[PDB]
Design a protein around this ligand. Sequence first.
Ligand SMILES: CC(=O)N[C@H]1[C@H]([C@H](O)[C@H](O)CO)O[C@](O)(C(=O)O)C[C@@H]1O
Length: 300
Amino acid sequence: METILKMGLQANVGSVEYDSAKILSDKISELSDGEMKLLLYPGAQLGDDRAMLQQLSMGDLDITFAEFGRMGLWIPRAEAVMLPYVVKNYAHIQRIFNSKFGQGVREEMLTNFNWRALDTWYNGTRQTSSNRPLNTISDFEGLKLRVPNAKANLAFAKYAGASPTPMVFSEVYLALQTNAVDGQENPLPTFNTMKFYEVQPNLAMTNHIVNDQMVLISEDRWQSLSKDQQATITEAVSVAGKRHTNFVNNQEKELITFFKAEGVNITYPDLAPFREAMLPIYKDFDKKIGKQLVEELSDI
Ligand SMILES: CC(=O)N[C@H]1[C@H]([C@H](O)[C@H](O)CO)O[C@](O)(C(=O)O)C[C@@H]1O
């Protein structure tokens, strides 16, 4: 081996994201005949996504994952893509990523922050688990709902009427287990592999945020690779992404049966009241960004 790359991710070994990172790594080695290798640093051992993104900018890490909307911390308009109920499905996030708006964000990521977006995959639609059944939006009143350190998720919790509790991902299981919080929200593969179902007796299909999953490489690293090495990474990303998105789609169907068998009570609230409750988020965001951006993205 001669060219050694490093990838970091928050998700643990055993997660869909890790499984796909291992595919990346295996395909990079296979297609390069062992000349290239990808080392893997899971479980947020390097920090959270925000920290790993900075490490990519500095060249201390080569590859990491990030949602398009997470770019909003550095490129404010991108946040709109993570506001609850804006993105309808994966095909919609693909239209956004490929649109002139998406291209403009991707160019800014490369120019300012040394991030080259190679693809974006489907990471699932977030759902809300809890220690009591949630059948209507009114049931969110008083719910101590853990959220990531992300304003969109915090706003979902706030406008649903819950009491948002930001917390890093690695601390969630213990907080649920001890009832320090009453619930969390994440896609179903995550709810499975993090074992949150072991400590959450209810799951509500709020369908509130569609998460993509960009594969970012340091632009400096990319430019230093040969054309052959670039082709290897492009093909590895294509192979891994096809498998990732398909696995998430399959799991979103198959996991319902599994969670029921494990004793989880699954509820399906009417979502029209949830969508209505989120409208002030869009008005505020449009006011801050200076245009009707949420509506323009929703119509892309
Ligand atoms: C790429 C990445 O690290 N994604 C992580 C996301 C994002 O940080 C968040 O959605 C904001 O974009 O948060 C989690 O879902 C969470 O803490 O519940 C864990 C997940 O691994």
